[PDB]
Every structure is written in C-alpha cells, then in structure tokens.
Design a protein around this ligand. Structure first.
Ligand SMILES: *[C@@H]1O[C@H](CO[C@@H]2O[C@@H](C)[C@@H](O)[C@@H](O)[C@@H]2O)[C@@H](O[C@@H]2O[C@H](CO)[C@@H](O[C@@H]3O[C@H](CO[C@H]4O[C@H](CO)[C@@H](O)[C@H](O)[C@@H]4O[C@@H]4O[C@H](CO)[C@@H](O)[C@H](O)[C@H]4NC(C)=O)[C@@H](O)[C@H](O[C@H]4O[C@H](CO)[C@@H](O)[C@H](O)[C@@H]4O[C@@H]4O[C@H](CO)[C@@H](O)[C@H](O)[C@H]4NC(C)=O)[C@@H]3O)[C@H](O)[C@H]2NC(C)=O)[C@H](O)[C@H]1NC(C)=O
Ligand SMILES: *[C@@H]1O[C@H](CO[C@@H]2O[C@@H](C)[C@@H](O)[C@@H](O)[C@@H]2O)[C@@H](O[C@@H]2O[C@H](CO)[C@@H](O[C@@H]3O[C@H](CO[C@H]4O[C@H](CO)[C@@H](O)[C@H](O)[C@@H]4O[C@@H]4O[C@H](CO)[C@@H](O)[C@H](O)[C@H]4NC(C)=O)[C@@H](O)[C@H](O[C@H]4O[C@H](CO)[C@@H](O)[C@H](O)[C@@H]4O[C@@H]4O[C@H](CO)[C@@H](O)[C@H](O)[C@H]4NC(C)=O)[C@@H]3O)[C@H](O)[C@H]2NC(C)=O)[C@H](O)[C@H]1NC(C)=O
Lengths: 205, 209
C-alpha cells in the first residue's frame, strides 16, 4: 500500500526550511523486500528525491519511505507531485498524486484572549490565541515571550467554518504568577496569505 | 477480498440521558452474491446476549450486500466500561470476524467550562466570536451546545477534542453573533454534557460585562 503526504506548513513558508513530499510504502514483505520509487512534478520526471532507511513493525512487515525535496514556491503555486511505487508483490505499479488545496488564499485574523476570571482562581491560567478566516487550512502557530520560545501550549486542528474558511485555537498555559507580573506573551502565526508569511499578536495583563 | 465489519458506538448524549436510546451498531459490507448469508452473535464482556435487532441484507449499487445489526445498550453498562463484541459469520470466511468496542479506558475527569468574551480587536467587525473553553475532561466523549433566551443558537462550531499534556482533553466552541446583539446585553449560554458532570450537565453564561 502507498500513502503520499504533503510538506509541513511551516516548511513551505520559510526559505531556510526544507519542504518535502513523502511517499510511504507499507506491508512490504520479507519475501519481496525490494521497493522502487519514481517521482514526477506536473508529469515531468524529476530526479532529486532520496529513499530513506527502513524499519520493521511489530506485525513483521517493513515500512519503506521516500522523501522528495520540493521548491517552496512550486508547492504554493499548486504543482502536482506524483509518486509511483513498484514491487514484485504488486501486480501493477501504484501511483498517488497530491497538491496544495485549490482556491483563493485568505489571510488569518489573529486575536488574543486573556484567561477567564473564573480560571484565575487556579495555579495556572490559559492564554488563548483565536486564528480565524484563513484558507487553505495549512498553518503554523507558536508562542514566545521576550524573544524566547514558550513551549507549554496546545493547538486545535483547523476547523472548517460556515464561510469555507478555517479557524483554530491555541492555548498557552502559564503560571498565574507570570501573568500577574505583567509579562508579555506573543502568539506567532505563519500562513501563506500573511505579509512575509508571518504575524504576531501580544497579550499582557 | 471478503466482507469487512465496522462497529459503531452510541452517540455521547445517548448514554448520558435516560430519555435517549443508546445503541451499538455492527455493519458488514462487501458481502457477495456467491455467499450472501451472514450471522451475527453479540457479547457483553464475553457473555453472549440475544436481544439485538438485525435487518435483512440490502444490495448496494456495487452489487455487494450491506447487513446491519443493532444492539441496545444500558446507559450504566456503557458508562461502567462494558465491552461490546459483534461476531460476524459467513461461509466464505476462513474464520468469523470479531470487532469489539467500549468507552475509552481510564478514570473519568470533570470538564472545567469557561466562557471568554470577544477580543477588543475583534469588536471593530460586524460579527464577533464568543468562546466556550472546555478543558480537563476524560473520556473525550462530550456534547457542547449554545443557547440564548432558551432558544438554540445554531451559528457555532466546535473543535474536536484535543489531547492535553496531562492526559485529559480540551476543546473550544465558537459562537459567531452579530456585534449588535452582544452590545445590547443579550445573555448567551454554553451547555456541556459529559459523564463526569453532576447530572451529566452544566451551563455557563456570557454577556457584555
Ligand atoms: C502492521 O503495522 C503497521 C504499522 O502500524 C502500527 O503498528 C501497530 C503495532 C499498531 O500499533 C498500529 O496502531 C500502528 O499504526 C501498519 O502500517 C499502517 O498501514 C496503514 C494502512 O493499512 C496506514 O494507514 C493510513 O494512514 C494514513 C495516515 O498516516 C499518517 O498518520 C498516521 C497516524 O495517524 C501515522 O501512523 C503515519 O505514519 C502517517 O503519519 C504521517 O507521516 C508522514 C510521512 O512521514 C508525515 O509527513 C506526517 O507528518 C505524518 N502525520 C502524522 C499525523 O503523524 C491515512 O491517511 C490513511 O487513510 C486513508 O486511507 C484509508 C484506506 O487505507 C481510508 O480508510 C481513509 O479514509 C483514508 O482514505 C483517504 O481519504 C481521503 C479523504 O480523507 C481521500 O481523498 C482519499 O482518496 C482516501 N485514500 C485512500 C482510499 O486510501 C490510512 O489510514 C498507516 O499509516 C500505517 N502505519 C504506519 C505507522 O505507517 C500495517 O498496516 C500493519 N500490517 C498489517 C497488520 O497488515
Ligand atoms: C460497495 O458499497 C458499499 C456501500 O457504500 C455505498 O454504495 C456504494 C456503491 C457507493 O455509492 C458509496 O458511496 C455508498 O456509500 C461500500 O461500503 C463502505 O465500505 C467502506 C469500507 O470500504 C466503509 O468505510 C468505513 O467507514 C467508516 C465510517 O462509516 C460511517 O461514516 C460514513 C460517512 O463518513 C457513512 O457512509 C457510514 O454509513 C457510516 O455512517 C455511520 O453509520 C453508523 C451506523 O449506522 C451511525 O451510527 C453513524 O451515525 C454514521 N455516521 C455518519 C457520519 O454518517 C469508517 O469509520 C471506517 O474507517 C476505519 O477503517 C478504515 C479501514 O477500512 C481505516 O482506514 C480508518 O482509519 C478507520 O479506522 C478506525 O479508526 C478509528 C479512529 O481512528 C478507530 O476507532 C477504529 O478502531 C479504526 N478501525 C479499525 C479497527 O480499522 C471506514 O472508512 C463504509 O462505511 C461503507 N459504507 C457504508 C454505507 O456502509 C463498499 O466499500 C463498496 N464495495 C466496493 C468493493 O467498492
């Protein structure tokens, strides 16, 4: 079986990062272990992909994986990436294709929300970052304070809204004492439809 | 390429309200014309039970049959973590197919429910978001609704439950309303149903401070 996966949203938005499309072949037998990959961008064979080392599963099968480096702007411009897998246990080669969601990108609106008054009776308080109105659903969200990453947060998956855009929430949990000291926290959002693919909103007592 | 079986749980509100009828549903698809006969057996914690309601096979547009069996469950049995097993027999199969379902294992934990008003920055728009944060609950089986003046507010969306660092779940529900209605002092309410709540229910209100 073959499964094709898109790049991580953050990887396509920063030129320093390395976006990759991943073709994953599962249920590779010990009897027929060999597996070949062929890659195509908009139908044209490209030759820069590389096949990774494999791992054995608890059901005594092999997961084999190939990774193709893509050009940030090619992905964002909607190029189609086709993988083709060939193996002796497969009657014919399996092909899979993927590309970015189609349609007009829409800029996220980013709002920060202080903790509930009713949560402020707790030891830790939640700071919320609502991100709404964005399209496609590919997005990344992080938190920081004083130019340093704040990693004690969780983010919901994007949810389809009634207007065809997406929204999500990110929740940073912090010690109530930090909040009370007037420390400034910032929700950072990366999306293709933002200027320079990035915006930040701050939240403070 | 024989039959495939799918086993579906009851809906969360169905186990939480005695007025409702919770059911587990066993569905068999890809049943062939060459071997069209299917038998179900049902088990609750491994003990066979005989009160399921099974429907005659229905041919699909792809010339295979779909056959459904429905077992009514007792609310407290589900909430007590009983395991429901559907066994499907068909003479083409090498052995019967068995699937099991139950409530997620672990100690239940009561949701904390908080309401959050619109961001000041959002109050320049024609419509604004009212947020209901629901956190610290386990299992993830939950229902969230909005009302105002005892009437459903239907213009809302809820995130799926998300696993938190401490093993519990959280989610957010977002009610979009006209800014006018918010500024007029209308009270909106977020109601939550979960097994760890007292009477399986709680409600929290939100209006212009
Ligand atoms: C033996 O075991 C191995 C390993 O399994 C593991 O081992 C045992 C011990 C247990 O603990 C298992 O629970 C454990 O998983 C089995 O290998 C598995 O093989 C199955 C196929 O049978 C694969 O299922 C597919 O999974 C993809 C999603 O996969 C991502 O997410 C997984 C976690 O959720 C993760 O495990 C995967 O690695 C992968 O993760 C991503 O990886 C990429 C690349 O590295 C990375 O870039 C991503 O960031 C990363 N993301 C995450 C979240 O981690 C899923 O998409 C597939 O679903 C489609 O296909 C199904 C049909 O098979 C269908 O039912 C679905 O609906 C869906 O169908 C598609 O739907 C779309 C619309 O939604 C539609 O447009 C498409 O047309 C349609 N496509 C169709 C029809 O295919 C699918 O579920 C597992 O990935 C794989 N596990 C691993 C670890 O690789 C093996 O099966 C076992 N062998 C036996 C017993 O026979
Ligand atoms: C021939 O036709 C039949 C009938 O289809 C119909 O007719 C044809 C001609 C076409 O026109 C079709 O468009 C038309 O629908 C085909 O039958 C289908 O077969 C597939 C499998 O090949 C089944 O796929 C599974 O679907 C379930 C979800 O099913 C619910 O939701 C569907 C819509 O989203 C809906 O269509 C279904 O009716 C069903 O709806 C629910 O019904 C219950 C009971 O009545 C009800 O209580 C609910 O309210 C209702 N819900 C909704 C939303 O309506 C999906 O869960 C399955 O995914 C699991 O298994 C996959 C492997 O097969 C795997 O990849 C997934 O990851 C997933 O795995 C599970 O993951 C979860 C969490 O991660 C975990 O808890 C589980 O343990 C794990 N499962 C395991 C153990 O693996 C799967 O995708 C279709 O349901 C089925 N259709 C119908 C109507 O029965 C048939 O395939 C055709 N044959 C051929 C050869 O083409």
């Amino acid at each position: 079986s073959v499964f094709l996966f898109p790049p991580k949203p953050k990887d396509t938005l920063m030129i320093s990062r390395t976006p990759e499309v991943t073709c994953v072949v599962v249920d590779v037998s010990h009897e027929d272990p060999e597996v070949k990959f062929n890659w195509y961008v908009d139908g044209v064979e490209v030759h820069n992909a590389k096949t990774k080392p494999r791992e054995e599963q608890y059901n005594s099968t092999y997961r084999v994986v190939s990774v193709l480096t893509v050009l940030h702007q090619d992905w964002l411009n909607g190029k189609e990436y086709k993988c083709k897998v060939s193996n002796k246990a497969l009657p014919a080669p399996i092909e899979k294709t993927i590309s970015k969601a189609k349609g007009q990108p829409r800029e996220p609106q980013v709002y920060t929300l202080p903790p509930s008054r009713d949560e402020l009776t707790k030891n830790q308080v939640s700071l919320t970052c609502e991100v709404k109105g964005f399209y496609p659903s590919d997005i990344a969200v992080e938190w920081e304070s004083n130019g340093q990453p704040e990693n004690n947060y969780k983010t919901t998956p994007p949810v389809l809204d009634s207007d065809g855009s997406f929204f999500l929430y990110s929740r940073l949990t912090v010690d109530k004492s930090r909040w009370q000291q007037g420390n400034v926290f910032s929700c950072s959002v990366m999306h293709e439809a933002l200027h320079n693919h990035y915006t930040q909103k701050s939240l403070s007592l």
